[PDB]
From a paper:
Human multidrug resistance protein 5 (hMRP5) effluxes anticancer and antivirus drugs, driving multidrug resistance. To uncover the mechanism of hMRP5, we determine six distinct cryo-EM structures, revealing an autoinhibitory N-terminal peptide that must dissociate to permit subsequent substrate recruitment. Human MRP5 was demonstrated to play a critical function in regulating cellular cyclic GMP (cGMP) homeostasis, which is essential for many physiological processes, including the maintenance of vascular smooth muscle tone and cardiac contractility. hMRP5 also influences signaling transduction pathways and may contribute to drug resistance in anticancer and antivirus therapy. From a clinical oncology perspective, hMRP5 can directly contribute to cancer drug resistance through the efflux of many anticancer drugs, such as methotrexate, cisplatin, purine analogs, pyrimidine analogs, doxorubicin, and antifolates from cells.
Residue numbers in the entry:
A (entry chain B): 46 to 69
B (entry chain A): 94 to 123, 126 to 501, 573 to 786, 840 to 1437
Amino acid sequence: CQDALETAARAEGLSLDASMHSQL
Amino acid sequence: TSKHQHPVDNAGLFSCMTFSWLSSLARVAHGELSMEDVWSLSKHESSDVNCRRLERLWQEELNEVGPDAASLRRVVWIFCRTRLILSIVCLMITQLAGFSGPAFMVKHLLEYTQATESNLQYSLLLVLGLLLTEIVRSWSLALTWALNYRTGVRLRGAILTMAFKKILKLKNIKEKSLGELINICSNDGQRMFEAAAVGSLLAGGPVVAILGMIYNVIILGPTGFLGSAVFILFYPAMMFASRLTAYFRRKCVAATDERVQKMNEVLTYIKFIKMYAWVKAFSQSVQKIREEERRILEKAGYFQSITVGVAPIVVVIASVVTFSVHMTLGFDLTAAQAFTVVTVFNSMTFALKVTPFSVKSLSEASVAVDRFKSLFLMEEVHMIKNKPASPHIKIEMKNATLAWDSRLQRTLHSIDLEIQEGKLVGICGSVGSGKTSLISAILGQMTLLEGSIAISGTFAYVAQQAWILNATLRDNILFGKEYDEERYNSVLNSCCLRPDLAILPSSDLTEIGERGANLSGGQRQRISLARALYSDRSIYILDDPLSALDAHVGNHIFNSAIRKHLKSKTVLFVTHQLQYLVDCDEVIFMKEGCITERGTHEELMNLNGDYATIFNNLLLSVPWSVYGVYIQAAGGPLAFLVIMALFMLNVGSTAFSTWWLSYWIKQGSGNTTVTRGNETSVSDSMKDNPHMQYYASIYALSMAVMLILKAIRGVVFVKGTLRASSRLHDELFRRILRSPMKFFDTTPTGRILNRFSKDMDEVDVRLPFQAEMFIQNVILVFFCVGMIAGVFPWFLVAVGPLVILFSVLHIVSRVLIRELKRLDNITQSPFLSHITSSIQGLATIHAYNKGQEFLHRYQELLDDNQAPFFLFTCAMRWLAVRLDLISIALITTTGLMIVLMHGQIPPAYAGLAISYAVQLTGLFQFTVRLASETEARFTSVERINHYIKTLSLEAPARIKNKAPSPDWPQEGEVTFENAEMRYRENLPLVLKKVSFTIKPKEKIGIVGRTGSGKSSLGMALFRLVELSGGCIKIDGVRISDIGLADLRSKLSIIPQEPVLFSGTVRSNLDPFNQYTEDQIWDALERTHMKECIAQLPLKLESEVMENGDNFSVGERQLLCIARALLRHCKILILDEATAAMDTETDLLIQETIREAFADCTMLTIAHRLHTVLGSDRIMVLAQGQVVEFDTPSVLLSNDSSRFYAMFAAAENKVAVKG
């Protein structure tokens, strides 16, 4: 989900935020 | 958004490759950027064209094999075929250049270094070719990234537009979850964009990895497969470690949810906890939950820190194994081959670090396509379009048989309905008779089996729930219609909206939420009428418009509007109140979907049918202070120094292993004479060194020491960060739990609850990871710079200018990048609000046929949200390109310095420098990326620390006056002497000069108006808030000389609302476990609760959830008094223990209270004058003053008494209903 094998590759111009969409 | 043509469409290959337009925009910005400065979405990226193309492709694919085996993956591939093919070709070129350049150039440079003759021209060609290849590959990667971003943006826009268009024509609106529908049109687009981007980036690993494997096999020989075997044995282990970390985080999520629920339960009833002195038990439970979460986080960090930094470790381990095996067998090894293999291993590590996110993106894309295909197969709604025989008839159905859809559920059979223009027709029936079925059928939500239905014109629909639009009073009422003064005034006056306008100071421009936060049911119903009136459709449909409305205002609105304005238009009325059909034109009764009696009102009354029966039935940037605070909380400077020392030790061990390899290569034969034929001479061969085993053992020991140090450093860092988190948790819990409740009164518990939840989850999930990654990257960069500068002392003269250039680039980039992110979320809130509002009112929009304006607004919002995101991605790519160019210049400078000094240094040192220079690619970008996300958590740390030093301190637990007496209170005598009470500063006084005496064994009933101060007696008796004047004496001892712990241990208060903490029944009675079983059983049987408890198999171990919603209300209240009995307090106060409960239950509760505490004083704070009769004395409060103090027997005998007047008023209110 957020291991080093994933966030390091997306650090080339991709936002570090998946959804942050849950509401009330 | 203000532009003529998008600069992307007017940019050449070089301009788009280097992103010159965004560089100019950033230079223009460099203190803030607004939406008027950014450019709008390009024409080629417009949502309309992409949505139309996607819809055409989907329609073409549907009519190929049928709507049963069509996959959206094929449609996406067809849509993006050209762009993805171009991206694949560009990435092939990039990988080919990145494999051909560094390895071949390093081999050629190191081969020339070993040559005796020196050439000043051949090396220049090599370095020029290396620089050209690096520039070409970087530019191709930039172009690939730009094309992928454009393709992803287009695909996201098209798919979101198609999803919104499909949802607007959904038949079964309630079939899908409310959250799922919003998530489909909100989160899925970003998932598709990222998935497409990293899937285009996917084809970079398997090609270059195989190329490097082949090159290593060709160069080294049969021993080149060792690195491949190491990679195959290592990377799946990292994947398994990641899976285990995810599995542990799965339980961590549940643990955090449980902790959050416990914190919410604690904060919800904080007043009760303070008044009951049960802080210790809840604190212990919270501590146990926190320690369980700490253990889970320790396991997660232990299973997570392994894969944080593994590429250099994997490279070094593979090099160690390969070189040791190759050299021990007696073969020959040279510096050039070894360093080429090292660089190729670095390339494989980069590729296999990029690949896992590509695999995850592919999985996410598959999930997204499956979810989208699940929704796209839903049934669509249909509209009635046929015309009647004559314009006179508006509604005409002949024996129509219609059924529900979910399969067909028949509800209407042989329907013969004919309604003319200008005739008011009402529908009568019971629940399930088919009144709602007719409303659903006339809209067009039912299928036709037999007969035909004639519909002319549109309909005006009013929702029972009164759905509202996220706008003001003016916007939603017009509903897109033209604004006129007289019509609006008449509509407002007809529905009696004047009180609503008077209540709201800015009712004309008052914003309303999605469902309505400052509106009532009647106001919502009235607004519905107003909107429908403005709509002014030919046919009016009323689905219970006066249900929640009061009778008087509903009848007034009916007479003023329906009987006057709608006299010449068709009106359909459906309601449960049949008294409004007396003046209606036609009456229709619905019963089981079959028409039995219909006609006029008098005919229906004369027929004496079921209608008559029911009628007569109803008639009756953060500063360094945050960093210092975090360092201090981590364990002081010692922990920081230890962590830094361990990190430097690991990095230095890796560097020392590499340097020892270089030293071993440089050593050679060590001036040893060997025989190679007829003559003996010194030969430069590493296989002739007699210290083979010594070097091999040192190399293996260095590798093992590096691994052990890395593991120890990871474990120590995880332990330190978790200890800091635990220290922060305990400190924050202690600060809040001891602060006065005035903070709770001023700031709602929701704010602190959200702060706790979000901040703690975010920090415990991200901060150790980001900190470890940033520290590792920074130390690796520093070591790489130092080692190159160590061999060449002149390397700093080029580093310096490059350092200041990098700092300048970071300064400029830190403003634009952080500004575009804010603008991206600025328009996201209107986007989410519009998405939520449309789904909550889909039926109303479908009835009003307003599916085009909403779609256009959605498209506009999608474009206005996609443009800043595209600009931000382009800026990120530009920054990455600049950092890559800086690294390329560094590598070129290193190579140029290497070339000039050939023949003066051993080739091993030059190879080491050129190998460490290659690894510098990507490290600068990683360091820059992690320097912005770490700060995002330090602001949360600062927010947490804000409440740490802001909360005040309450009264001390132990008062220096000591305990008054071991048996205090000696009796139950209380006295008041000029009691002064105020809630807060500058607030009006609640109690002013009130003094009274209460004799032992007396029943006192306090009754008064709201705000008199009746509820303030309990607050002042418990010393909840320090008194502003006067003194209170209890048994001859002043209350203020007794500590809070001792004062509350001998007084009892019954809460107004039954409270049941989650956990166990025993834990809800005495968590500290001070009482024995027999006393608890006697207390339970005193309130007749023994039978209801012993019946369960877990009488003392029964599970109680939140609010205790598993017993009856009376059982909960009885348990409440049973709990209040355990403390054995001589003073008891009752405050409104009855609220909407049956009669005999309250009688039993009253008799149980009377019999249980006959020996305890009573202070009854009740508003019902009937329940206070029979007490010893009656207390009356008049705005904080006492006027009457005597027995109720003489109070009711005086007509001038205020208590008698209140009792008479209550009796009149009870008697008159009316």
